[PDB]
Design a binder for this molecule. Sequence first.
Ligand SMILES: Cc1cc2nc3c(=O)[nH]c(=O)nc-3n(CCCCNC(=O)O)c2cc1C
Ligand SMILES: Cc1cc2nc3c(=O)[nH]c(=O)nc-3n(CCCCNC(=O)O)c2cc1C
Ligand SMILES: Cc1cc2nc3c(=O)[nH]c(=O)nc-3n(CCCCNC(=O)O)c2cc1C
Ligand SMILES: Cc1cc2nc3c(=O)[nH]c(=O)nc-3n(CCCCNC(=O)O)c2cc1C
Ligand SMILES: Cc1cc2nc3c(=O)[nH]c(=O)nc-3n(CCCCNC(=O)O)c2cc1C
Ligand SMILES: Cc1cc2nc3c(=O)[nH]c(=O)nc-3n(CCCCNC(=O)O)c2cc1C
Ligand SMILES: Cc1cc2nc3c(=O)[nH]c(=O)nc-3n(CCCCNC(=O)O)c2cc1C
Ligand SMILES: Cc1cc2nc3c(=O)[nH]c(=O)nc-3n(CCCCNC(=O)O)c2cc1C
Ligand SMILES: Cc1cc2nc3c(=O)[nH]c(=O)nc-3n(CCCCNC(=O)O)c2cc1C
Ligand SMILES: Cc1cc2nc3c(=O)[nH]c(=O)nc-3n(CCCCNC(=O)O)c2cc1C
Ligand SMILES: Cc1cc2nc3c(=O)[nH]c(=O)nc-3n(CCCCNC(=O)O)c2cc1C
Ligand SMILES: Cc1cc2nc3c(=O)[nH]c(=O)nc-3n(CCCCNC(=O)O)c2cc1C
Ligand SMILES: [Cl-]
Ligand SMILES: [Cl-]
Ligand SMILES: [Cl-]
Ligand SMILES: [Cl-]
Ligand SMILES: [Mg+2]
Ligand SMILES: [Mg+2]
Ligand SMILES: [Mg+2]
Ligand SMILES: [Mg+2]
Ligand SMILES: [Mg+2]
Ligand SMILES: [Mg+2]
Ligand SMILES: [Mg+2]
Ligand SMILES: [Mg+2]
Ligand SMILES: [Mg+2]
Ligand SMILES: [Mg+2]
Ligand SMILES: [Mg+2]
Ligand SMILES: [Mg+2]
Ligand SMILES: [Mg+2]
Ligand SMILES: [Mg+2]
Ligand SMILES: [Mg+2]
Ligand SMILES: [Mg+2]
Ligand SMILES: [Mg+2]
Ligand SMILES: [Mg+2]
Ligand SMILES: [Mg+2]
Ligand SMILES: [Mg+2]
Ligand SMILES: [Mg+2]
Ligand SMILES: [Mg+2]
Ligand SMILES: [Mg+2]
Ligand SMILES: [Mg+2]
Ligand code: NA
Ligand code: NA
Ligand code: NA
Ligand code: NA
Lengths: 62, 62, 62, 62, 62, 62, 62, 62, 62, 62, 62, 62
Amino acid sequence: VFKKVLLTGTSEESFTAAADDAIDRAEDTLDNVVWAEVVDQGVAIGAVRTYQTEVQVAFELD
Amino acid sequence: VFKKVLLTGTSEESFTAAADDAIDRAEDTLDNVVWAEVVDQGVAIGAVRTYQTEVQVAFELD
Amino acid sequence: VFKKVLLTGTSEESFTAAADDAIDRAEDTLDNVVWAEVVDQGVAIGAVRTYQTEVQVAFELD
Amino acid sequence: VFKKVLLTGTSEESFTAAADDAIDRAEDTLDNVVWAEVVDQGVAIGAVRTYQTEVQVAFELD
Amino acid sequence: VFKKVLLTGTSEESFTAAADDAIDRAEDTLDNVVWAEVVDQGVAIGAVRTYQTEVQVAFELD
Amino acid sequence: VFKKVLLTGTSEESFTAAADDAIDRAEDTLDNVVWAEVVDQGVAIGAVRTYQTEVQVAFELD
Amino acid sequence: VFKKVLLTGTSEESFTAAADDAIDRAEDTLDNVVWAEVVDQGVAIGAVRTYQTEVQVAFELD
Amino acid sequence: VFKKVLLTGTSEESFTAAADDAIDRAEDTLDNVVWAEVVDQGVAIGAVRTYQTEVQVAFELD
Amino acid sequence: VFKKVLLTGTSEESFTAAADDAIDRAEDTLDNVVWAEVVDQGVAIGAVRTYQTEVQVAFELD
Amino acid sequence: VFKKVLLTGTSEESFTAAADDAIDRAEDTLDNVVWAEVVDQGVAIGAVRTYQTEVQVAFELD
Amino acid sequence: VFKKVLLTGTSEESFTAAADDAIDRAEDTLDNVVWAEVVDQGVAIGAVRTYQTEVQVAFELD
Amino acid sequence: VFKKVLLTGTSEESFTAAADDAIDRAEDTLDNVVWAEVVDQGVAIGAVRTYQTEVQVAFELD
Ligand SMILES: Cc1cc2nc3c(=O)[nH]c(=O)nc-3n(CCCCNC(=O)O)c2cc1C
Ligand SMILES: Cc1cc2nc3c(=O)[nH]c(=O)nc-3n(CCCCNC(=O)O)c2cc1C
Ligand SMILES: Cc1cc2nc3c(=O)[nH]c(=O)nc-3n(CCCCNC(=O)O)c2cc1C
Ligand SMILES: Cc1cc2nc3c(=O)[nH]c(=O)nc-3n(CCCCNC(=O)O)c2cc1C
Ligand SMILES: Cc1cc2nc3c(=O)[nH]c(=O)nc-3n(CCCCNC(=O)O)c2cc1C
Ligand SMILES: Cc1cc2nc3c(=O)[nH]c(=O)nc-3n(CCCCNC(=O)O)c2cc1C
Ligand SMILES: Cc1cc2nc3c(=O)[nH]c(=O)nc-3n(CCCCNC(=O)O)c2cc1C
Ligand SMILES: Cc1cc2nc3c(=O)[nH]c(=O)nc-3n(CCCCNC(=O)O)c2cc1C
Ligand SMILES: Cc1cc2nc3c(=O)[nH]c(=O)nc-3n(CCCCNC(=O)O)c2cc1C
Ligand SMILES: Cc1cc2nc3c(=O)[nH]c(=O)nc-3n(CCCCNC(=O)O)c2cc1C
Ligand SMILES: Cc1cc2nc3c(=O)[nH]c(=O)nc-3n(CCCCNC(=O)O)c2cc1C
Ligand SMILES: Cc1cc2nc3c(=O)[nH]c(=O)nc-3n(CCCCNC(=O)O)c2cc1C
Ligand SMILES: [Cl-]
Ligand SMILES: [Cl-]
Ligand SMILES: [Cl-]
Ligand SMILES: [Cl-]
Ligand SMILES: [Mg+2]
Ligand SMILES: [Mg+2]
Ligand SMILES: [Mg+2]
Ligand SMILES: [Mg+2]
Ligand SMILES: [Mg+2]
Ligand SMILES: [Mg+2]
Ligand SMILES: [Mg+2]
Ligand SMILES: [Mg+2]
Ligand SMILES: [Mg+2]
Ligand SMILES: [Mg+2]
Ligand SMILES: [Mg+2]
Ligand SMILES: [Mg+2]
Ligand SMILES: [Mg+2]
Ligand SMILES: [Mg+2]
Ligand SMILES: [Mg+2]
Ligand SMILES: [Mg+2]
Ligand SMILES: [Mg+2]
Ligand SMILES: [Mg+2]
Ligand SMILES: [Mg+2]
Ligand SMILES: [Mg+2]
Ligand SMILES: [Mg+2]
Ligand SMILES: [Mg+2]
Ligand SMILES: [Mg+2]
Ligand SMILES: [Mg+2]
Ligand code: NA
Ligand code: NA
Ligand code: NA
Ligand code: NA
């Protein structure tokens, strides 16, 4: 059985690096992280631009 | 990093109040709740009508 | 077996009350109305604003 | 010919009132506003909750 | 309030049995599981075929 | 001209058998049923699990 | 209150004429037909090509 | 950079001619119109039928 | 077994004629072409307007 | 690099068996078939019912 | 009230840089640009490849 | 007439570079490749992360 958690990663560099930020967090906390699916991307536009990539991060249960 | 939980709030009054019911629960349980996105709305039709609003509730991790 | 009819309710007050207007009509005409799913919302903007909520209204057959 | 502008209205009260806030702004600025279609709803959760309703606001050109 | 978890069940037999595998896991771990909504289906094609059914599994909170 | 009715069939066995339950009902009641399109699937989880398959059932008019 | 019926019109000429074929049928049978929304288009390719246009046909109830 | 405006053209003849009506208006008003994407089609059913085609009309900025 | 190929037909006349252009090409090249499903429509706006209709063209294998 | 082909399998038994029919055909013809994603399901209703499952069948190139 | 404009940015380098190109243009022309949502990405393939990222760029009105 | 093939490119570097990997393969094999549309993005998470970008790659026929 796989389970997915819905995480939004952030980066001041790129959409790829924002996906990684979410995956990094998942791997800190979860065992058996196996894949991620991009579901949305955006940019917070303030003092700097922050690229955001929202991913479903799949991990194998047990 | 943001995380979202997928909650369905309920109200005998309105779709807005059903969204609030979900957010109320999130805030009871989670720190740093920052936004909600409506993903569905419905009505359970029994003795009374119960309005339901399903929301992705985003919170900041750490 | 459930069947759904696709109804647009209207209200000069709110989206919730427009959903109810559709459900009211369904219940006038159909037995065993059990739930409704919101599929669209809009506003007709004339002399007054009329809120519209389109719902699939599910009823149990037999 | 109709044209649509993509506006997000806000309210501390309800999704219906947030739709109205967008329509109010459209009518301040545009002639012949004829309808609105809801495309998204959300809630900004800070000191207070701010309900947001995003609408395509249609107006007749000329 | 209902909450949903996003689970992918697996079976070497059928899409129905893969949905059950996810629900089985939910029920092992959660109280008050009330429904599931299919969101995706697939097949891993290796030595054998493994049918997968992804479901939002809804449970009542408290 | 074809017309579609939106029916949810149920089965304690499988998604295929729930689709059939809807089609069975359509054929009881309608002439010239020609096809069905699956639009949703779910499971009601109570004492037993009830698989549901929602189909648009197309029939030829006249 | 508006109600919609889901009809597929056909024509050996065009997608527009297939939409009309569905609307023609609706008007034969229903009072107060007010609008149609295209939801799908296709072509049956046999001895001849038959253009099909599927429309939600809205009519005002009462 | 391209920008899109969301226009609904109308015709008493066809969906193609309603798309053209929107493009005609865009070209009256905008420089460097380069393409259009159909996003919706409908029919207003009154004294006569008016075919509507909604298009995103893309133009190159500067 | 059916297979679909994803083709964009073009016409200086209409969306219907652009669908035909794709089907014409399919039939030149493939045996047992049975149906087409419209998936997109657009217009290239240059010296002349070129209507485009993108279709999944289904053919029976063997 | 993966490539997908869009195939509709058929079965007089089940949606699972119709998915298999498509995969069977893919494997007859293609090397390195690795997965399938369900994209649609339907039923042809004639003398008998024929369950159809449409799948994107992914294979690794080279 | 927020308003969104639908812009396609371009870059010979990356999807992130194409999003920036659109945001750059928005900021040249508009006050109070606050966020962007990616809605599409593509590549024009000619002499060189040009990455395109289409964004809804949100700005606060007044 | 344009035709599209559905390819998933891969890169250990970025989503942009994974799109390129798919386009590279298309150009190896096909004449008159003209554009690509991103349809999905993901990450395979193993020993290393492999970014994947799925594109419809359009080419002109003849
Ligand atoms: C993709 C996306 C979508 C967003 N949508 C909304 C929104 O819908 N309402 C709102 O008030 N704020 C935002 N916002 C938040 C705007 C904050 C940008 N400002 C600073 O970062 O300082 C938002 C942000 C992003 C990245
Ligand atoms: C939005 C939505 C969708 C629903 N869908 C289903 C459904 O698909 N199957 C089913 O058996 N029950 C329901 N139901 C549950 C019907 C219960 C209504 N009856 C009472 O509340 O007493 C359902 C409910 C709601 C609100
Ligand atoms: C959600 C929605 C969508 C609509 N779409 C269209 C439309 O697409 N074309 C059109 O001519 N009229 C309308 N209209 C109808 C415009 C009528 C508003 N005027 C008055 O109520 O007097 C429409 C209305 C609504 C509520
Ligand atoms: C619907 C929606 C969506 C949003 N999405 C994002 C987002 O995706 N990223 C982000 O940084 N901020 C937001 N935000 C902004 C969060 C700000 C909430 N805080 C305060 O209002 O003080 C956002 C807001 C809303 C309403
Ligand atoms: C629905 C679905 C989707 C998939 N998508 C991808 C994918 O997008 N990339 C990838 O590398 N692998 C897979 N895969 C994994 C391919 C593994 C199949 N091989 C074996 O089971 O041994 C995948 C699998 C399934 C079931
Ligand atoms: C697909 C689907 C979706 C559903 N959605 C809702 C829902 O959204 N609200 C709700 O109150 N009940 C349901 N329900 C109904 C829950 C009832 C399960 N319990 C028993 O069957 O005894 C529901 C059911 C199904 C099958
Ligand atoms: C849009 C659309 C979609 C279709 N889909 C299917 C399908 O999914 N399965 C199937 O067996 N037949 C069809 N078919 C039916 C194929 C019949 C074409 N042959 C003749 O008209 O003689 C179909 C038709 C159309 C118009
Ligand atoms: C595609 C589309 C959608 C529409 N939707 C709505 C609607 O949702 N509500 C409503 O009141 N009117 C309309 N209407 C407007 C109905 C007006 C038809 N009557 C006359 O043209 O005289 C509408 C129209 C069209 C073309
Ligand atoms: C539906 C659709 C979508 C399109 N999208 C893009 C696009 O996204 N980028 C781009 O550079 N060109 C185009 N283009 C191409 C613009 C070319 C129009 N000019 C001439 O035909 O001479 C495009 C075209 C069409 C028909
Ligand atoms: C999912 C799906 C969708 C379909 N859609 C259409 C359609 O849209 N038009 C049409 O003429 N025929 C069909 N058809 C074909 C109807 C043929 C059923 N009759 C027999 O099998 O003998 C169709 C079939 C299926 C399975
Ligand atoms: C995402 C996207 C989509 C596109 N769609 C179309 C299209 O649908 N029709 C068409 O004629 N041209 C294009 N085109 C335009 C093809 C032009 C590529 N050639 C050169 O850049 O020189 C197009 C382009 C892009 C980027
Ligand atoms: C986007 C996407 C989606 C995927 N979906 C599935 C899936 O649905 N089932 C499954 O078994 N495997 C996968 N997989 C495959 C998991 C393999 C990751 N492991 C290694 O790369 O070693 C998958 C992969 C990717 C990239
Ligand atoms: Cl828009
Ligand atoms: Cl989710
Ligand atoms: Cl419907
Ligand atoms: Cl495809
Ligand atoms: Mg930096
Ligand atoms: Mg988002
Ligand atoms: Mg009360
Ligand atoms: Mg729901
Ligand atoms: Mg009042
Ligand atoms: Mg509507
Ligand atoms: Mg207040
Ligand atoms: Mg939004
Ligand atoms: Mg076995
Ligand atoms: Mg999946
Ligand atoms: Mg049993
Ligand atoms: Mg459902
Ligand atoms: Mg003829
Ligand atoms: Mg169809
Ligand atoms: Mg005329
Ligand atoms: Mg519309
Ligand atoms: Mg000509
Ligand atoms: Mg297109
Ligand atoms: Mg049998
Ligand atoms: Mg289909
Ligand atoms: Mg360069
Ligand atoms: Mg695009
Ligand atoms: Mg590297
Ligand atoms: Mg994918
Ligand atoms: Na989730
Ligand atoms: Na219907
Ligand atoms: Na717009
Ligand atoms: Na394809």
